[PDB]
Structure 1
């Protein structure tokens, strides 16, 4: 029962971490600055 909610919270945290990692090294943030 609650294990589903725990796994969903863990997956949401992992997705947020992946989004932050892709945005921090993003082409519009990192590679865009690398070309500047």
Structure 2
């Protein structure tokens, strides 16, 4: 039963990591700075 909570925590961590990766070099962060 707790394996579901563990998988949910792992998926939440992976989603946060993917969001941070997409936002750090985002079009508003990286590509937006590419023009500057």
TM-score range relative to shorter protein: over 0.9
The CA distance in 1 between the partners of 2:30 and 2:19, in whole Å, is 14
- Post-superposition CA distance 1:1-36 (Å, at most 9, x none): 000000000000000000000000100000000111
TM-score by length of 1: 0.97
Unaligned runs of 5+ residues in structure 1 are none
Moved over 6 A (4+): none
TM-score by length of 2: 0.97
Unaligned runs of 5+ residues in structure 2 are none
Match of 2:20 in 1: 20
Give the number of aligned pairs.
36
Q: How large is the Cα RMSD of the aligned pairs?
A: 0.3
